[PDB]
Design a protein around this ligand. Structure first.
Ligand SMILES: Nc1ncnc2c1ncn2[C@@H]1O[C@H](CO)[C@H](O[C@H]2O[C@@H](CO)[C@H](OP(=O)(O)O)[C@H](OP(=O)(O)O)[C@@H]2O)[C@H]1OP(=O)(O)O
Lengths: 495, 43, 240, 96, 48, 48, 46
């Protein structure tokens, strides 16, 4: 508490201020420029989703070897560097990229101050920031295109500068500075150009041109929660029981988000761990993410990823377990009990057993297995209520969830939904030109991203050891990969 | 011509200042600054 | 010119410029010189072959800048080597690259220039290393040349052979014999060997075999003079 | 020693044996208690293997660090609370 | 009759131990009490 | 069912497995006061 | 208060839970096997 903001790698977010007051919003995963949405909620009240402004204070790595690596396409046009020379040369470029890291790790610790030149990178999409100096925007050619790179390039070169720059140069950056950046090489500062966009009533183009566009340093979480074990922030979990070996599954069966848990197959083996364990748990304070980090008296809401639905409970009367669309009630704000052992060291727990107390009804939460529906055996409707007894059978814990898979799946699912929309356009009639140039050939690139298990070795019929993901393949079947099948049916059928 | 550092003014004039197989190679480079987006046109 | 001016007597003149006051007047140039040299060779890791060709006569100024590197090189061990040590961990690479490799274009006066550059770079490095003792500092420059004894041996054999093959009858106009350059390298390696043990193991191996150019060259010189200057010093010097 | 050792395989009774059982082959002139062994200077097992000016300094630092890890933090918290309370009195003083 | 490098080290340890036997315990107790009080405010915040 | 005896001296059926009810509390950690401890005789087999 | 239960030789007791919820009860001193008494009081009230 001597002063804040001393470490590159912070867990923060951003907000537009001024003409159109939006947020840093990647429209999907496959697009290339962010948007400015008045669709988004207040500056004091972020929307139901706010996971898109996930930037991090990146060091200024180099790109010259990576540039001379990519000089390599010009060498594809022409050879002779050629062969081993070419390889070693780009291999050296790769070593230099390794060296960029073997700088950033050392770099952590630096007090982030005024006038510096820093880089950025997303987390949710985990894509880069580069503004072109010769490739324009969509609305005006004078505005420069702000790109989302897989690797990152020299348009990641910024000027961390507030609105007026009344805060004089050299000092640390106050959390709340209206940070007007400036590209080093590209020139033109960033603009929140208020212009309507495709499929966007609703959203405004993020671009680079001489203007007076202000921002804000918007903290989400301190740098010390970069410990990946430390279950902080919006990190995501799985609500998977252990004595039953079943995860807490939600489904809109009767057009009602019944939250239950599926009958567990196998088991002598571990979890099949389906996608109905999408849970993120966050603490509650009206300014978001208050200080103290003790996690003892901390109180929590439960959030599902794919649905726009949080989690509450009320009474049954013939106590309930369904999911709720909103985030302002008290009856959704549940509670925990860390591992049930003698611990005053629980300042941040990790990936272990949990429980629940209630606040209003103020009882424990049982998990006594009572089958309900006669719709189908190995049922899909159960009961989870709030009763002041507690047994060993409440063995609920936390999965440290693998990040990459989640991201992959989400982009695929969103693409599929648009894919469905694309299919609808074709169905109504024909489609336009550049849709073929954009997303139509991007079909198997999403398939060959995690490879889908579409090519492997050959042995006896049970797939066992190692070649591509079964999870990915089933997931592929999973985000209406069925829906994609219908879309594909429609394309040939239309022809 | 192609980007919005100017408007869509004549490609033919640009080609005239550089429109043999060499001309075709030059055209490919020119098209690259000016490639796609109906640079030749929508036909 | 700047290098020439800086070189004027070290200790006070050398030191004074080298550190200054006012953040070295918005200048602590030795690091800048290293960066400039890197840009010129722009090895940025392995030097792009030819960069030297691109330098054309221009590398000779950087050679004189490398000479100005030795211009900010001679004697003043503490200031010089404070910068030297910093550079060794810090940039060392231009010198390392020069030691590691030759030039793609067979240069006209370039062979001599390249040799001069190696000798110079070698001299600067050697001076700094000797003064320091600075073991891991030399271990870091030795971490620059991890190729070690094998690389050195190959270079020595090649240079000596070339020199013998075309011995030059141009007396005392520059001892740029291939063997002369190699001899300078050998001296530096021995000086380096006082830092590092593994390198010393490689050197012992170089000493015993089916005799070779390497033993002959040491015989042409294995001095290890060890004089001590002014006062309060415990110094060890070699020179061929 | 040489007579008893000479005679067998040399592996048997090794440690000093098969140590020196190769060492005669390369004849390297350096087996013998030249000066450094001598016995003596045990010094009560070097004060139970305890080190120099430095060991005592290290002990001071360790003690200082562990002890220091708590009190000032506490003091600051209480100071802030007391200060918060006076401000309250100040607010009452400037209250209407 | 005063001893080696060690005697001085021993003196440091003795001083440190006696001094150390009290303060952190006190600090922890007060910390817990303050924490208990904020929780009370938190309870009021989530009270109805 | 096996006889659980009260010995004057003690013998090899004093050999137990300190294990909770489900053994959901994973092996290696300390025993929580309140664990539903389902023991197991080592040599005799049959749990209590 | 860092964590409890660190020392063999503890001063504790036992309670049966489940079907019959009794205690570890030596019927007298001269017998050979313990009993499970519902005669015994509550788990919360010994
Ligand atoms: N811990 C568990 N205990 C018991 N069954 C389990 C289990 N976790 C998952 N299972 C479920 O029980 C089924 C298997 O007994 C099923 O396995 C399915 O899991 C699929 C994973 O996507 C595989 O299909 P592939 O993608 O073709 O590999 C697999 O078949 P496989 O042997 O070929 O891998 C199979 O279909 C799986 O959950 P489901 O009921 O199947 O949804």
């Amino acid at each position: 508490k001597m002063s804040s903001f001393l470490h590159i790698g912070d867990i923060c977010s951003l907000y537009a201020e001024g003409s159109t007051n939006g947020f840093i919003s990647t429209l999907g995963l496959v697009d290339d420029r962010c948007v400015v949405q008045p669709e988004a909620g207040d500056l004091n009240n972020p929307p139901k989703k706010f996971r898109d402004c996930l930037f991090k204070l990146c060091p200024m790595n180099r790109y010259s070897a990576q540039k001379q690596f990519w000089k390599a396409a010009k060498p594809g046009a022409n050879s002779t560097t050629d062969a081993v020379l070419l390889n070693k040369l780009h291999h050296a470029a790769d070593l230099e990229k390794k060296q960029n890291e073997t700088e950033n790790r050392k770099l952590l610790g630096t007090v982030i101050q005024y006038g510096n030149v820093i880089q950025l990178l997303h987390l949710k999409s985990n894509k880069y920031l580069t503004v072109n100096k010769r490739l324009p925007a969509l609305l005006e050619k004078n505005a420069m295109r702000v790109t989302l790179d897989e690797a990152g390039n020299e348009g990641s070169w910024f000027y961390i500068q507030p609105f007026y720059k009344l805060r004089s140069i050299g000092d640390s950056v106050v959390i709340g500075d209206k940070v007007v950046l400036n590209p080093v090489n590209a020139g033109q500062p960033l603009h929140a150009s208020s212009h309507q966009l495709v499929d966007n009533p609703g959203c405004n183009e993020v671009n680079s041109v001489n203007c007076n566009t202000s921002w804000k340093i918007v903290l989400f979480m301190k740098w010390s929660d970069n410990k990946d074990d430390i279950l902080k922030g919006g990190d995501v979990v799985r609500l998977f029981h252990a004595e039953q070996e079943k995860f807490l599954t939600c489904d809109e069966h009767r057009k009602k988000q019944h939250v239950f848990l599926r009958t567990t197959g196998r088991q002598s083996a571990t979890s099949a761990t389906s996608s109905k364990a999408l849970w993120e748990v966050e603490v509650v304070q009206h300014d978001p993410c208050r200080g103290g980090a003790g996690y003892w008296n901390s109180l929590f809401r439960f959030k599902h990823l794919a649905t726009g639905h949080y989690l509450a409970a009320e009474v049954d009367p013939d106590y309930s377990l369904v999911s709720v669309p909103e985030g302002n009630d008290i009856s959704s704000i549940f509670e925990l009990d860390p591992t049930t052992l003698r611990g005053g060291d629980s300042l941040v727990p990790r990936n272990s057993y949990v429980r629940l107390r209630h606040l209003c009804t103020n009882t424990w939460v049982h998990s006594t297995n009572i089958p309900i529906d006669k719709e189908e055996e190995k049922p899909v409707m159960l009961k989870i209520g709030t009763s002041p007894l507690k047994e060993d059978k409440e063995a609920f814990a936390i999965v440290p969830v693998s990040p990459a898979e989640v991201r992959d799946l989400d982009f695929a699912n969103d693409a599929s939904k648009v894919l469905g929309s694309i299919a609808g356009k074709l169905e109504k009639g024909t489609i336009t030109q550049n849709e073929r140039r954009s997303v139509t050939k991007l079909l198997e690139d999403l398939v060959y991203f995690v490879t889908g298990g579409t090519n492997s070795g050959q042995d006896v019929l049970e797939v066992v050891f190692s070649k591509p993901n079964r999870e990915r393949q089933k997931l592929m079947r999973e985000q209406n990969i069925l829906k994609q099948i219908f879309k594909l049916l429609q394309a040939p059928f239309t022809d | 011509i192609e980007t919005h550092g100017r408007n869509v003014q004549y490609i033919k004039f640009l080609q005239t200042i550089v429109k043999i197989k060499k001309c075709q190679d030059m055209v490919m480079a020119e098209l690259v600054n000016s490639g796609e987006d109906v640079l030749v046109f929508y036909n | 010119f700047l290098q020439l001016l800086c070189e004027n007597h070290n200790r006070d003149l050398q030191n004074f410029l080298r550190c200054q006051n006012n953040k070295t007047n918005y200048n602590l140039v030795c690091e800048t010189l290293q960066f400039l040299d890197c840009i010129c060779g722009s090895t940025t890791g392995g030097l792009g072959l030819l960069g030297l060709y691109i330098n054309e006569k221009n590398v000779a100024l950087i050679n004189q800048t490398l000479e100005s590197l030795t211009e900010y090189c001679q004697g003043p061990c503490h200031e010089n080597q404070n910068c030297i040590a910093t550079h060794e961990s810090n940039g060392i690479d231009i010198i390392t690259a020069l030691i590691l490799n030759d030039i793609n274009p067979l240069g006209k006066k370039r062979m001599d220039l390249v040799l001069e550059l190696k000798n110079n770079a070698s001299k600067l490095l050697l001076a700094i290393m000797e003064s320091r003792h600075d073991s891991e500092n030399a271990e870091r420059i030795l971490y620059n040349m991890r190729p070690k004894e094998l690389v050195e041996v190959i270079k020595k054999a090649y240079m000596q052979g070339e020199v013998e093959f075309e011995d030059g009858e141009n007396g005392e106009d520059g001892a740029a014999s291939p063997r002369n350059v190699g001899h300078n390298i050998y001296i530096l390696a021995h000086q380096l060997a006082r830092h590092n043990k593994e390198l010393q193991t490689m050197l012992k191996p170089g000493g015993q075999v089916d005799g070779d150019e390497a033993l002959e060259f040491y015989a042409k010189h294995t001095a290890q003079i060890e004089i001590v200057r002014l006062d309060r010093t415990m110094e060890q010097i070699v020179f061929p | 020693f040489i007579v008893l050792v000479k005679v067998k395989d040399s592996t048997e009774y090794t440690g000093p044996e098969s140590y020196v059982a190769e060492m005669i082959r390369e004849r390297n002139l350096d087996w013998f208690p030249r000066m450094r062994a001598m016995s003596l200077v045990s010094s009560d097992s070097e004060g139970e293997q305890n080190e120099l000016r430095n060991l005592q300094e290290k002990l001071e630092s360790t003690m200082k660090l562990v002890t220091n890890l708590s009190g000032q933090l506490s003091e600051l918290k209480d100071q802030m609370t007391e200060q918060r309370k006076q401000k309250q009195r100040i607010g009452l003083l400037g209250h209407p």
